[PDB]
Design a protein around this ligand. Structure first.
Ligand SMILES: [Ca+2]
Ligand SMILES: [Ca+2]
Ligand SMILES: [Ca+2]
Ligand SMILES: [Ca+2]
Ligand SMILES: [Ca+2]
Ligand SMILES: [Ca+2]
Ligand SMILES: [Ca+2]
Ligand SMILES: [Ca+2]
Ligand SMILES: [Ca+2]
Ligand SMILES: [Ca+2]
Ligand SMILES: [Ca+2]
Ligand SMILES: [Ca+2]
Lengths: 336, 336, 336, 336, 336, 336
């Protein structure tokens, strides 16, 4: 036990299961009772880089809002949130003779909705959105106390279904100083074009247990864990044309000989990340099969190049048999 | 005693009662003295996810404002509060020749009343209400120091009966910067329509004991416990046409084999949650029977589908004999 | 000694007296020296819910401003404060041609006086008062640093006799942003009606001893103890047509078999709460008798219903012999 | 072990390798498995001046976003960030007769993008940029809460590729007080010239491990480590005409006899800093050779003078065989 | 070892050297290897008054930005910083008929550059500069967050070479309230004269080691160490017509018999402070000799009087053989 | 050793000297080596009331900016600072038709210089100055962050010689809200009179040693030590027509029999406070004799009355032989 996470090294290498809050060896008969087999590394406290260790992830005492796909030590608990924008309303600043003040000529108010995907929940969201109009960033606004939405659960929005979206109209750190806009930009957008909004960063905390049996949120942050997770993991995004899922799977650096991380191919990583039931050698998700022939796979330039290099020296010419290295981005689009 | 909550595992599995602040086994003769039988899990400190453990809930030393229905370890102590709005008054901003300034053309002041349902009290309420007019969110306001109402007890309002409702007219973090509204929206609402208000989130603390014998409120929060409770519990709401009650009951995930949570049907969950006296095999609440034939039951699409699947393989065709799984939403409307 | 408040259980059940800072048994000869007999429960540190325990209350080391009626462990130390309003003065905002600005058309300044009743003193009062005019809450103002009055003793006002009342004219968290009022409301109140003011909540601290021999105020609060006291106690208010007294007496829940609280009738609760000398079987207060025949008793609907149910099965038909349960509200008006 | 960094002095002098989190001696057969040989000093906890020690750097437990070139104890982990500016937009402040207010005659809004080079990431960037126009510093602005960009990873920008740049338009500590500009400067820049922007300083924190197994960011700073690193290290910057790299390598002061730092020439420092594979005695980077003949080397006056003094007494007349002393600045431009 | 700085008293009196982080006696053969001989006092932890002790100064573990001349325990580590001002630009506040508002009639913006001399660096500079015009202090401004420059290294400026100077235009604690100026002063300075700026005080922290192996800056200050150093030390300033150097050397009070400080003449103090190589009995600095005949020496009235008293009773009539007492100010100007 | 300040009671009563940081008995031969004899009390930690004890004062480890006259335990270390005012400049607030706004009709800016006398330095001065004009206090201003001058050494000013005085023009807690003045006061002072300024109180900290070997300033204050020192000490002020000195000497209350303080006459107190060399039985200061015949002595009414009572029963009719009691104020003016 070099890593000191109450898991033996042989257990962490050859497979283990958590039963009655203790680790036991893996046998083939354990799969009939609903158990799972986990493989991790014996030189690190947390394999995936998330703030929970291997034993906390495998036992399932991190939280009760984190999905069961993040119980695997090789799958990182990481929320990916975004902002959906609509209904930009313009307030005229003319004084009634008339008085067309320039510089501060109108005001803009937007309706936003925060959406979360992934596994973990964000307990205090604070997105930073910038407004783009005709290739010109008008402003960059970080959410104030009126726009901070606590306990954004995974899979649902902060303004829930059946509720009107949030309003964003202020710029100051406190709720004052409404967003101004030039007269030239006002006359430009009144003719033909619209204003788009995009997110840049989101800051949020996570819940951790205390020594008194309670959980605590304030003091933690996700901003110091994004840089660690994104550099050692590959990103797989699946679209079912009605919902979307984004997952990060840990990979092994082949050049480093001190990285005793288990090696996963594309198919095993997909099965352990998204959550699927294997039947007749075919992944099936809930009902929709996600094999290579049935669905469409979208890569990047580097991912396609790496797959092309790793496909020339394979006995079996399948995409899912290619070794998964860090930095890959995979998109899986199911047929309609 | 794996969970370390001074309750033995056999006691926690086969039923137990708290007498003289110690746990004892359950016998059939204990029901004649007014005692209750509790079943919990032996692998978790708190079964329902509320910040009080099984022993604290069963003994009854959490607080003296929490209802006796939350003494059961399977019933979570969770307040559900809301905002009732009335009497939106409009202040004209015309200067008297006239001067109709646009952008900031009028002001709105609303009267609000905070209502609490459930079991636990919220010790420092801070609701976040947004105003909707013609499908357009005008503003989203979080309550300031003048609108924060401490010690909102369960079953009653923060402005008590015989008192005028609270006033909401400010937008800034401090008490300044009255709510503006466009001239177009002013002329729109002056003709035919009205302004609605809805709640989005409420943040509040809870009282916990200290090592000095006193209780402490500041430092705790409810926002980190909503996401844990709502993902592992089912929600039952009962209407008596004059008051409403909302309760959350813990359920068991069948796929997870490490969840040693007791299994409850619909009838047992209703009886242990709302509080009822069983007579001739019929639940009776206070006086009004709440059996399946007498009252009306309202489900959702997923709840009705799950009940339809679980009803085809039952020897007795009754709704209350269906196993209760997580995610169900049940509404019970009594006849008038 | 289960409760661990250095009081034995038999002493706490059969009666005890504190002499030389230690507890001794009660004899009939102790009443001739001016001693009192106390009964409490042996399963709780503090019976009445106030932040002082049974031994602290019985010995008399809580404070020296708390009344001797709160020395009894069954009587809670709880201040009830209120605001008396007068002399609303209106400031015109017309600019002299004239200029009648709407929205912010005048200002209001009120004179307030904080009054305290009960036993304990409030060490830092901060009342929250709302102004009602023609059934319309104009504003809700929480007292700022200029309106916070420390060490409000029981039985007297914060602006003492011979001093002009406090002034309330600001709305902002700091001393700025004077209270505005519409032109319509100004012309409405200038004709026939007046503006009333009511209190909604008051936040205040209490003094507790430290380990260094000093007392400390900042850090404590009364807002977390109102919800506990008001749910387990009955309220008795006595009027002598010149002063008023409000007291809370602890009661026993009959359905709960783990509540080992002593049972008190109406007469014993009145005698132990308000403070009276028994002579010829008649309570006498200071000089004015407060028996059922001499004075007038006012109940509520629930209190009268409970008394009617509990009066049909009594051998002696007297009001003071009825068992006192929680939730009762009693008013005692002495004849003039 | 004088320095107390669990590394023996003979190990730290003659070469060592970290295997299974313990230090072992270096043999020639270890290079075939992918291992590296490290040399450090035995009188200091951290040789390069970065906040991580020799054992933390050599083992590789500092962070997972730091590049593998900073695993060497002689290479300092140090981010170098900068600001790229574009799209200065001017807002007129004329009131429409006209009204040309002087002093505050227009406003300027800039679009900025933060770029990071080096090894370590900056976890909370706060650049300080000043605007120069016609040799006149108009203003110096430090980034506010809307312009602070957390977790700026090495090798990429804070507004990532495919996103519009950040907006800078405020001057006050809070988001208010837009940037003013004189009428003379407005008429000066409207004719022929443009406004440039430059960075002056950047403040940022770094992530360090805690005793609870988590990492912490707030409390640390980079501003107290720049002065230590820059005085004892030489700077080498390499340009590949599409990306740039900047590295700092520790050097030895020859006059100080208590500096037991290993001596490195130019070639060894380049190979250990930038990261290169030696083949046939030639450095090759990724594919592009970076030998003295193939690429162009740019020095300063002091660097060229020191190389000229150290080149007259060399048996082999090569640039890479010159001893590297502190204060040198080297630029390596690859051919196109 | 009375002073408890792990240095023996005989070692501290007769000379010592730090080798392998331990103190050893001084021999004449140690000068051939590059070692130095130090003399200090045995009754004080730090002889010079700087926040580093004798052992920390002699070993060289204080910091790596402090010059090697401050390694001597008799030379205090003390930065002397100043502000160089240029390019005062005037902003007219006339409104265009015209409108010449008095009191606030124009604005002034200055360009400043912070320069550091001495040994230690200032880690957070905050200079306090006042503006003088025609013998009238217009304003006194302390630098805000936009004008605070961290890690000002010794020997170089905060806006480095090749960068435009810092801008100073605000007066408020936050970045607001631009500097006003009277119309009389505006018309006075527009005719013939200019505005000068001078520094009054500078506040800055210093870096010290922690128990966790890191260094910490916030919490320390230089303002409590200026008064101690300046009262017990003499100041020597040397000018080479292109750079300037300022040093403080500790002196001994002759009247106090409990001051066991070593006695230094002018020549030994100059050699140990500025740093010089002795050759043929002549100081030589880098190359320029700084003997009494070659260069010009400038004193004050008190310094010249003390030298005149101490020169009448000397066997050898040289300036450098005069005993150096506290309070002396010496200027050394090299020939051009 | 009752007082526990590592000084024996017989040593503290019969005289003692601090040599090699330990206390030794006094002999007549110790005066030839430059030593001093100290007498203190054995029932108090600090005799004079200053925050340094008897051993700290006698040894000389308090600070290095405190004068040697405060090394005596009977002389309190106490700075007396003041403000010298000049150059009140008036800014007109007329708008140019004209516009003479009343209430806020002009502005005043003063030039101030802080001077320190006594022994100890004030490390963060914050004087509170009020402006008097025609017997009317215009305003009372406490110094803000721009006017706070750290490390005010004894004997010199905060704006040193050769520097322009500080500017005072603001009134708000932050640097805003310039000082207004009425039109009536403006026309009153423009004719014949001037505005005077006086100090009322000054708040400042002092430096004390820490357990880590450093000194700390923030957290201490002088405001809690003025009331203790001024009630038990007599004040002697000496004028040499070019500088002034103010000292406080501890006295003994004759009525209290528990005050074991040594008794001092006027001459011994003057010699031990101001610092003088006794020659031929005559005090001589530096060169100017300060005997009763040569210089002029100025008392108050109470001081002259006490001297008249204590002079009738003296064998030798000299002023310096009168016992010095607390509350006396003595002024010593040397001839010109
Ligand atoms: Ca392990
Ligand atoms: Ca592990
Ligand atoms: Ca248990
Ligand atoms: Ca349990
Ligand atoms: Ca007890
Ligand atoms: Ca008790
Ligand atoms: Ca070592
Ligand atoms: Ca080392
Ligand atoms: Ca020593
Ligand atoms: Ca020493
Ligand atoms: Ca003593
Ligand atoms: Ca003493």
């Amino acid at each position: 036990d070099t890593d000191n996470d109450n898991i033996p090294d042989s257990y962490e290498r050859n497979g283990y299961t958590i039963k009655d809050l203790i680790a036991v060896k893996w046998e083939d008969s354990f799969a009939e009772q609903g158990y799972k087999k986990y493989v991790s590394n014996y030189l690190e406290s947390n394999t995936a880089g998330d703030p929970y260790t291997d034993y906390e992830k495998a036992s399932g005492s991190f939280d009760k809002a984190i999905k069961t796909e993040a119980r695997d030590p090789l799958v990182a608990a990481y929320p990916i949130v975004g902002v959906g924008m609509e209904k930009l309303i313009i307030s005229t600043n003319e004084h009634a003779g008339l008085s067309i003040n320039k510089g501060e000529s109108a005001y803009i108010n937007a309706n936003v909705r925060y959406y979360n995907t992934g596994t973990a929940p964000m307990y205090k969201v604070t997105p930073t959105t910038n407004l783009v109009l005709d290739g010109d960033t008008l402003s960059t606004i970080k959410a104030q106390e009126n726009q901070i939405g606590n306990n954004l659960s995974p899979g649902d929005t902060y303004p829930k279904k059946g509720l009107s979206p949030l309003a964003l109209n202020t710029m100051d750190q406190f709720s004052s100083r409404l967003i101004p806009i030039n007269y030239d930009q006002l006359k430009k957008l009144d003719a033909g074009k619209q204003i788009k909004l995009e997110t840049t960063q989101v800051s949020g905390n996570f819940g951790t247990k205390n020594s008194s049996g309670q959980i605590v949120t304030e003091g933690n942050s996700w901003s110091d864990y994004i840089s660690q997770i994104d550099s050692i993991s590959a990103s797989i995004i699946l679209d079912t044309e009605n919902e979307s899922y984004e997952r990060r799977v840990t990979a092994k650096n082949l050049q480093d000989p001190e990285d005793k991380t288990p090696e996963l191919t594309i198919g095993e990583a997909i099965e352990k990340a998204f959550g699927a039931t294997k039947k007749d050698g075919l992944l099936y998700f809930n009902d929709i099969p996600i094999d290579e022939s049935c669905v469409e796979l979208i890569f990047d330039d580097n991912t396609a190049n790496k797959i092309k290099d790793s496909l020339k020296t394979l006995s079996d010419k399948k995409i899912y048999n290619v070794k998964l290295e860090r930095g890959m981005n995979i998109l899986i689009k199911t047929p309609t």
